[PDB]
RNA sequence: AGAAUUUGGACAAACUUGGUCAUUUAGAGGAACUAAAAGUCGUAACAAGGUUUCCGUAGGUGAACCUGCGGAAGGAUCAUU
RNA sequence: AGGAUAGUGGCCUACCAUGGUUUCAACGGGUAACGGGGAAUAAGGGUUCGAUUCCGGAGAGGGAGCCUGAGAAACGGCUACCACAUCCAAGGAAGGCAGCAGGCGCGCAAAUUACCCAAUCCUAAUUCAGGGAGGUAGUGACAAUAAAUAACGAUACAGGGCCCAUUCGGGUCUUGUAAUUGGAAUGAGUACAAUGUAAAUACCUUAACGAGGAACAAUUGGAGGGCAAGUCUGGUGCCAGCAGCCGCGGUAAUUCCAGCUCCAAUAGCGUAUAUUAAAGUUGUUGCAGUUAAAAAGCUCGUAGUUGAACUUUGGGCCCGGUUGGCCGGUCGGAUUUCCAACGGGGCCUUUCCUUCUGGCUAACCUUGAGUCCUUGUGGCUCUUGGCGAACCAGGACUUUUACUUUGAAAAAAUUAGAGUGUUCAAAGCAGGCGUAUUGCUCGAAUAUAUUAGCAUGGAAUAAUAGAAUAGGACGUUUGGUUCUAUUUUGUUGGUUUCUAGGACCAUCGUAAUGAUUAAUAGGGACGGUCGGGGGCAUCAGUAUUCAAUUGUCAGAGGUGAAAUUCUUGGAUUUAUUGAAGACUAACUACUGCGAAAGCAUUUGCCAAGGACGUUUUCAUUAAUCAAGAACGAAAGUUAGGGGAUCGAAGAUGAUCAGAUACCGUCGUAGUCUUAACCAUAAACUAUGCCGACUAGGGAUCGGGUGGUGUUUUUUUAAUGACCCACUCGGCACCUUACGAGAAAUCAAAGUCUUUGGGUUCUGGGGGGAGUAUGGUCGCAAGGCUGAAACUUAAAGGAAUUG
């Protein structure tokens, strides 16, 4: 594993083995689906909704109480981002560090980490070129890239 | 997956990297840089013709101890000079000087034999006459 | 990566099967494993198996008679005409009697005699005796 | 009707010069390699080979080589709760 | 658009546009390349060859051009030029063997200046002429088939015998030896003849000749090993020579030169060169890469290759081809629901097989009239408008692809192979049987022929596409718009109305209306952490050197021993205080972090990161990667700064034969930093990366989870630290050898001849040589890429004994 690493951490949620889930939950779907859309309006990532909702609210998994999954919640309201969220927080990672690396150019390391950084974001932006996620010819062009994630 | 490619669309990889690692073979290389024609004292063929420009004693490679008489030849189909050795007892007398001789290799194709340094050809006529029939006094060389 | 899970589920078998176990554990458990089990179940190389219901790809346990010498796999799933069939046989099996060289037709996978009498044939999947 | 002759075109051999590509080839002299048995000078390596060897780099010296700087043990140490 | 052509076409022209190919290898270079059918070898896969009997193409010394013609850019046609070249009376004129024969030349290398149209066929006005096409013969050890060089007696000794050959006879049984001895047999050769043939030669046949040393005389290589066959004899004495390779030969040579004997193949046997097998030493099957040659220093990354799982399963019914299985009533051989086992099809279970025009008129859904066979569920007639769905040529008609099946196609020869006594055989396609009285008859099969294309069945595997802002499907509905249209209208043309049929669109209906998992794949977020990961700054520490003060007095340094050097002007040593630059001791470990290179004083700032936790999110976004890029010790280069220390160069003192080395004292560059270069190390775990599985154990680092577990702090709450038990991840270790390996050894170097999870790189005996050359990068040093000629039987790895 570790696309950019020798990493071989396993690590992950293990989800249910129930789909319809869990007899102590007496709210209605609906309700957790305007509670999704107001963290939403309070411009709320979907794995910030999912996370808000499972730790301050009984919400096991959204896509589980509700009929689908968040980001398809939020398309549907008229939510979407322009951009997929893990996209812009790559983005936003590589802009991070590029300002640091006009300010610290002997930071060679950093240097080598914003191409690993920018190698997955090119990846991840083709990926979403083919599903037609993005527009084609969508390209992350590194010099005002700071545009569409601030 | 040991190395080399295994998917059924890999052909293209398969083939080139065995085109790739033939010219490691010494018999390959060879044929298909046309060594034998280009630089070689026969181009390529399995006899020659030449004429003996002078004899030789060559002293043989140790742990051997012997004058192995050869002959210095001028091919005329190239103008090169080869060293052939001339194989009996005796024989060297029946090569004489501005004979016209048959040589051919010895059957290392290339690489000298035994102990003789450097002389990969052997008289096999001389004066159109077998030197195994003139050893052997079958037949005699045409003085006139 | 995991690039052939029927590669994956055979070693997990011969591994088994070659240290005595009379039992082993297979992820993911594709359907073609399930076929393939299914042609080895019925020439008697594997016991009875059975297939665990995850939510995901499911898992088999399949019980060992001990009398397996060798599954394997061929990958790529090479074409497979008619008339070469016999080459197959011939350079996997260790005799003309015994042992199936497991292929998939349109027909569906099956043994090299099974292909032999419906006079079909694909591509090869493997091998048991 | 019509020959010699004849204008202008396209086709265009061929030659001259020049350019370029290819193969082969002479060469004072220089510098290598190899073989060739028993040549001269040392003893560099193999033992801790008598300064442990070797790697990269740099300088130096008849010559093998020496020396510095970093590295390896293929070391002469698998070892000091 | 035109011209030209037989005609399409930038074929050409005018105008216009800026296209076309290419890392899926364009363009260029080489070819000791004509292509194919084929050939050699070969377990299978492969490798090499194919100038050459057939097919296609090209050419006629090299070019170009053209005439006649249906057809030629023709060459046994012409024109010109270039090259070569013949005749000449000097004026001129005539040429094209890569047709046949023949010559020269070239070379290792290839035959007669013959006879004939008899056959095969071809041309012509044509039965007739012509044909170096073709056939016949000549040369011919290219290759191939068959297969003489003897066979058989009697006399010599073997001996294997039986009545205990007693000691050998016996009518034993002669295989082997007597350069004896006997009569038989035959073609090699020679020829009457006939046959053969266009005529001949030859073969086949044949009268007469034709073997005793049946001289009618078989050779070529060998005899140490590989490798079958001598230690026999004479010669030679590291010479001559042999020997593919290992090796023989220097006075006993089984190896040379010979004789004898023997071996192998034999009308053939050696030699050279090439090629195939051997070679699993080219590798798809099927190699190797820790140490033998070979894992790029490291990471990113494009093309390529590869890529988790999931969508109709299961059951039932019917048709239904094949073995025998039972008259064995034909002296263990039909027949058959007794069936079984395979194999195909249809139907039903929620089940597409699209479609509207019209002739099918159901294995007749529904049995008016009729069950004249002594009982059965294997055999019925004009049918109650009878789903007229059992095929013809047009769609409100088409998801694409790989794969596989069958068919067909893949000239003949050739290959395999069926038949056939060419006397056999290679071959050939013949032939065979009578009543030979008036001709009868079997053949000239079959298979394979790879890829591409064509038709067809299948629907597993592997891709692809579909309904998500519904722009979705169904359609019995209802509109509208537009288009077309026969019979007709009353005949000819148009404008039309209904009706008919595309298409789109509006507005009603219908519906389970429509989004696969959540990969012990990956990415992202979040949480508390961890780390000598990085950058910038900042801080500290002694120590070293030096300086200034400072006491005291002879030495101090350095070594194995000394010299060199400082020193009564005070050296060394003591003390106080400074300055500078570097380094970061001990703690520091089979511990940590980093892609590697590397990274160890504090603190602050900055960006990052792994692991863990997670009932968060996305949903295949991934693995490995030519090309392409970022980083990359030390040394080294450039320019500043700094220059304490140590210190390539240099100096000097020693040592020694020498010492331009080791040792001693100095000492420039360098060591440090900044801004650029360079891009290499035994850059090493000499071990590519990703994934799965196969054995036991304890320790350890990071995260987590759980103990009415200790411990300090108020006495114990908690937290920390520690203990125990688990768990994920990591650096390692130990035992064992499942298994692997040549071993050393290895939990990977295992799951390999029981050989296939994905993927990248590299190697192919030792040298020459990482050399030369070209290219490219670099200021340079140099780096990357990288041969050959030649040379060589070993080099090498691991282990054992000494
Ligand atoms: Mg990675
Ligand atoms: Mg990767
Ligand atoms: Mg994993
Ligand atoms: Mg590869
Ligand atoms: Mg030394
Ligand atoms: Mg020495
Ligand atoms: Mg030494
Ligand atoms: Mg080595
Ligand atoms: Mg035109
Ligand atoms: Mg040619
Ligand atoms: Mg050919
Ligand atoms: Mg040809
Ligand atoms: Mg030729
Ligand atoms: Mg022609
Ligand atoms: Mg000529
Ligand atoms: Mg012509
Ligand atoms: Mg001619
Ligand atoms: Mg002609
Ligand atoms: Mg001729
Ligand atoms: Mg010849
Ligand atoms: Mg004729
Ligand atoms: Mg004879
Ligand atoms: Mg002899
Ligand atoms: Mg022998
Ligand atoms: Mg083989
Ligand atoms: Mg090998
Ligand atoms: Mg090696
Ligand atoms: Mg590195
Ligand atoms: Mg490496
Ligand atoms: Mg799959
Ligand atoms: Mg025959
Ligand atoms: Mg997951
Ligand atoms: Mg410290
Ligand atoms: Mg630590
Ligand atoms: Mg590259
Ligand atoms: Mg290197
Ligand atoms: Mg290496
Ligand atoms: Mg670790
Ligand atoms: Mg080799
Ligand atoms: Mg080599």
């Given at each position: 594993g ?15 083995y ?5 007899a102590?939950?007496?709210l ?19 794995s910030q ?23 398809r919640?939020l ?12 996209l ?32 997955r ?14 527009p ?11 545009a569409?994630?601030? | ?5 295994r998917?059924?669309?890999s ?13 490691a073979?010494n018999?390959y ?9 280009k ?42 000079k080869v ?18 001789v048959?040589?051919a ?10 102990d003789?340094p450097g002389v990969?050809?052997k008289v ?11 050893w ?9 | 990566?995991?690039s ?8 997990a078998?011969?591994?088994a ?20 089990l299914?042609?080895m ?6 016991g009875?198996?059975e ?14 008679n001990?009398?397996?010498n060798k599954?394997?796999?061929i990958?790529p799933?090479?074409?497979?005409k008619?008339?070469?069939i016999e ?11 015994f ?6 037709t ?6 090299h ?13 493997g091998?048991?005796?």
């Amino acid at each position: 594993g570790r696309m950019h690493s020798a990493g071989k951490g396993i690590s992950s949620s293990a989800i249910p083995y129930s789909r319809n889930a869990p007899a102590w939950f007496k709210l209605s779907s609906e309700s957790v689906i305007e509670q999704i859309v107001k963290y939403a309006r309070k411009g709320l990532t979907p794995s910030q909704i999912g996370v808000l909702l499972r730790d301050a609210h009984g919400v096991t998994q959204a896509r589980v109480i509700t009929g689908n999954k968040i980001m398809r919640i939020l398309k549907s309201n008229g939510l979407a981002p322009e951009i997929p969220e893990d996209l812009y927080y790559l983005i936003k990672k590589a802009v991070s560090v590029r300002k640091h690396l006009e300010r610290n150019r002997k930071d060679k390391d950093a240097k080598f980490r914003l191409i690993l950084i920018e190698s997955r974001i090119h990846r991840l932006a083709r990926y979403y070129r083919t599903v037609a996620v993005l527009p084609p010819n969508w390209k992350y062009e590194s010099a005002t890239a700071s545009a569409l994630v601030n | 997956g040991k190395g080399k490619p295994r998917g059924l669309n890999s052909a293209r990889k398969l083939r080139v990297h065995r085109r790739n690692n033939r010219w490691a073979e010494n018999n390959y290389k060879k044929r298909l840089l046309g060594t034998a024609f280009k630089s070689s004292p026969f181009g390529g063929s399995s006899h020659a013709k030449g004429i003996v420009l002078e004899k030789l004693g060559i002293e043989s490679k140790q742990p051997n101890s012997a004058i192995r008489k050869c002959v210095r030849v001028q091919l005329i189909k190239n103008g090169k000079k080869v060293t052939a050795f001339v194989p009996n007892d005796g024989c060297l007398n029946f090569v004489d000087e501005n004979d016209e001789v048959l040589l051919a290799g010895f059957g290392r194709k290339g690489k000298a034999k035994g102990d003789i340094p450097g002389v990969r050809f052997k008289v096999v006529k001389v004066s159109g006459v077998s030197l195994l029939a003139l050893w052997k006094e079958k037949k005699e060389k045409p003085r006139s | 990566t995991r690039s052939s899970v029927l590669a994956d589920a055979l070693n997990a078998i011969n591994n088994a099967e070659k240290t005595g176990k009379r039992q082993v554990l297979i992820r993911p458990s594709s359907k073609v494993i399930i076929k393939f089990l299914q042609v080895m179940q019925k020439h008697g190389y594997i016991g009875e198996f059975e297939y665990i219901d995850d939510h995901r790809s499911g898992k088999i346990v399949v019980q060992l008679n001990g009398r397996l010498n060798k599954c394997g796999v061929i990958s790529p799933r090479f074409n497979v005409k008619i008339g070469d069939i016999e080459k197959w046989t011939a350079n996997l099996l260790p005799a003309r009697q015994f042992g199936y060289v497991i292929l998939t037709t349109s027909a569906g996978i099956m043994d090299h005699e099974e292909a032999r009498r419906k006079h079909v044939s694909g591509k090869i999947l493997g091998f048991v005796y």
